[PDB]
Structure 1
């Protein structure tokens, strides 16, 4: 409830990125004039990176603003780096 005030831009940009991804998927599906090689993979990579960074920021804010017990900060950064590297 009260946590949404400080993160609204984050969900806004997450939704915008997802909508842009769906729109460009449809754009590729229509006509398929492009080649789905390195550029489309790179686009997927960057959108994945930004969305997981946003999710990690949300987790950090929730942990730091609600309760610090049972969660160690920075470990979520490690998991995000691991996922993007994978």
Structure 2
């Protein structure tokens, strides 16, 4: 079910929530009102963890549900191409 898949998804949904919290902290910037380069770099690479995460999430969700929508290896290809 949802709770069983979330028990399988323990190592990814918590990381997605923590990265959304980090993005919300970056909305108030977490510090003085300043913008730079490594600011934008750490603003970038907290997205790639959640996109690899939701790739693993949809791998678990197609193992849970049906396979009417076949070929997921190109889906992990496209999820990394989005990054």
- Relative contact order higher in (CA < 8 Å, ≥ 6 apart): 2
Count of matched residue pairs: 83
Gapped runs of 5+ residues in structure 2? none
Render the CA deviation track for 1:29-60: whole Å, top value 9, x for unaligned. Answer: 47963752221222122210011111111111
Cα 1:9/1:43, change in 2 over 3 Å: farther
Render the CA deviation track for 1:63-86: whole Å, top value 9, x for unaligned. Answer: 1221112231212201111100xx
Query: Once superposed, what is the RMSD of the aligned Cα atoms?
Result: 3.3
TM-score (norm 2): 0.64
